[PDB]
Amino acid sequence: QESLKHLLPDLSAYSEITIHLLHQLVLACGDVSLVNAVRLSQGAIASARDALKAGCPVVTDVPVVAAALDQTRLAHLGCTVKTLIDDHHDHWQQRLQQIPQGSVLAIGYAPSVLLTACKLIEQQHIQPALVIGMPIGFSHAPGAKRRLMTSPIPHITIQGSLGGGLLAAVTLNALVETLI
Amino acid sequence: QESLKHLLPDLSAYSEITIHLLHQLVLACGDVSLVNAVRLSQGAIASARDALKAGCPVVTDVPVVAAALDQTRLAHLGCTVKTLIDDPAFWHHDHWQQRLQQIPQGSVLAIGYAPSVLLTACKLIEQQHIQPALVIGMPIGFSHAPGAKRRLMTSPIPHITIQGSLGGGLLAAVTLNALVETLI
């Protein structure tokens, strides 16, 4: 049998949109443990879908995350895609400080970007509709994702697995697919 | 602090293109252990690059592999992308194995989901019914996936696969996108 539903644990206690997201993540990289390692805050899906319906700005930390996004469906919705790091003025922290209210912030690489975003959120300077915080496992990543877990912002992250990287783009793509 | 080469172990036994491939794979899914688990046959790189430079067909098992491919760069090289299974029964006439059996000599076969497709490809190759230039065998870890990949690693056809449970649509597509990137 090559049925994803048969390979994964019973997911009936999760919502249809959550199961779709979890399927896409497992299909992308094969790690069935993502079923338990993906953590969604209570407002994450509803806040993300409202933002995307309104054509919110989408911001990634690095270009390869943006390149993995389904930019056709995003443009279809009216969402622009921009990146904080292209490769002392126009530093990524200045771009982050300016992120528009209600935008989706997808972080697939840098823990430092996630840390600064969580600080800016605590201090109520920025208010994205969603932070997808899935940086690569550099030395500061566990701390950055712990700060995200207690952030009041709606968010999705990965705890208890090495997942990160372009999985941040898979996550947003899946949410867009539930809308288009 | 946030340098990928300094996060990964030293890879100085491998070529620059192989190292780029492994970096792209870690970036795809965050699993640093992939640098240990990926298996390339001897000249998989040149076999892949020679086929891509000829504008070879690129054949995937399922549509989500195709969708993650950089179709723009492939188009630039003249490569057409087709998919074996349109909706991921075994008694139909246009079965996916009927298509696999027609794969042109020298095409790239990228498998990111079904071990059955990988195993069928291996058996067709053993009987010399098909002759791809490269097999990227990265199915999901269904119960028969380890045997299919073991079968592939005994094959004389150039291949890239993963020892262990990782695999998937993104990983197979990222592998091919990384090889295309080194060209264009």
Question: How crowded is residue B156: how many other Cβ atoms within 10 Å of its Cβ?
Answer: 8
Decide if A59 contacts A113 (C-beta within 8 A). Answer: no
CA terminus-to-terminus distance, chain B: 30
Provide the token pair at B73: 């760069």
Provide the token pair at A85: 């790091």
| 3-state SS record for A98-116 | CCCCCCEEEECCCHHHHHH
A40 vs A156: CA distance, rounded Å: 5
CATH for A4-177 is 3.40.50.10230
- A23 contact residues in B (CB cutoff 8 A): none
Supply the DSSP symbol for B40. Answer: E
Decide if B167 contacts B140 (C-beta within 8 A). Answer: yes
Helix intervals (H) in B14-131: 16-29, 34-37, 44-53, 63-68, 71-77, 96-100, 115-126
B119 vs A99: CA distance, rounded Å: 49
Question: How crowded is residue B169: how many other Cβ atoms within 10 Å of its Cβ?
Answer: 30
Q: Closest Cα partner for A162 from A143, A139, A134, A133?
A: A134
Provide the token pair at A163: 């997942």
Distance in Å, alpha carbon of A13 to nearest chain B alpha carbon = 23
Residue A151 CB contacts under 8 Å (≥ 6 apart), including other chains: A118, A121, A122, A131
The answer, for B174 touching chain A at a CB cutoff of 8 Å, is yes
| Kind plus residue range of the DSSP H or E element containing B161 | strand B159-162
Helix intervals (H) in chain A: 4-7, 16-29, 34-37, 44-53, 63-67, 71-77, 92-97, 111-122, 141-149, 167-177
Chain B residue with Cα closest to A141: B2
How distant, in Å, are the alpha carbons of A160, B99, B100, B135, B172 from that of B69? 29, 20, 19, 15, 9
B1 vs A137: CA distance, rounded Å: 11
| Kind plus residue range of the DSSP H or E element containing B181 | helix B169-183
Question: How crowded is residue B119: how many other Cβ atoms within 10 Å of its Cβ?
Answer: 20
Bridge partners (DSSP) listed for residue B178: none
Q: How many helices (H) and strands (E) would you count in chain B? A: 10, 6
Q: Closest Cα partner for B28 from A109, A59, A112?
A: A109
Provide the token pair at B5: 């080469």
Provide the token pair at A18: 């959550």
Instruction: Report chain breaks in chain B, C–N > 2.5 Å, as residues after which they occur.
Output: 88
How distant, in Å, are the alpha carbons of A172, B82, B157 from that of B96? 31, 11, 21
Say if strands B58-60 and B81-83 run parallel, antiparallel, or are unpaired: parallel
Phi, psi of B111 (to 5 degrees): -115, 115
CB contact under 8 A, B29 and A163: yes
A165 vs A63: CA distance, rounded Å: 11
A66 vs A106: CA distance, rounded Å: 9
Phi, psi of A5 (to 5 degrees): -60, -35
Distance from the Cα of residue A1 to its chain's centroid: 31
Q: Closest Cα partner for A38 from A159, A134, A140, A172?
A: A159
B15 vs B23: CA distance, rounded Å: 12
Decide if A20 contacts A178 (C-beta within 8 A). Answer: yes
Decide if A173 contacts A24 (C-beta within 8 A). Answer: yes
A96 vs A165: CA distance, rounded Å: 19
B92 vs B175: CA distance, rounded Å: 32
Residue B14 CB contacts under 8 Å (≥ 6 apart), including other chains: B22
Chain B interface mutation, best of A22, A24, A166, A171, highest count of B Cβ atoms under 10 Å: A166
Distance from the Cα of residue B179 to its chain's centroid: 10
A172 vs A70: CA distance, rounded Å: 9
Q: Closest Cα partner for A148 from A110, A109, A108, A119?
A: A119
Question: Which method, experimentally, gave rise to this model?
Answer: X-ray
- Provide the CB-side half-sphere exposure for B31 (13 A, CA): 23
A6 vs A175: CA distance, rounded Å: 23
Decide if A97 contacts A121 (C-beta within 8 A). Answer: no
Domain B39-183 part of CATH 2.60.40.1080: no
- Provide the CB-side half-sphere exposure for B39 (13 A, CA): 19
- A29 contact residues in B (CB cutoff 8 A): 28-29, 31, 166-168, 170-171
Chain B interface mutation, best of A8, A23, A24, A31, highest count of B Cβ atoms under 10 Å: A31
How distant, in Å, are the alpha carbons of A30, A33, A138, B72 from that of B67? 17, 24, 29, 11
CB nearest to A165's CB, from B30, B114, B116: B30
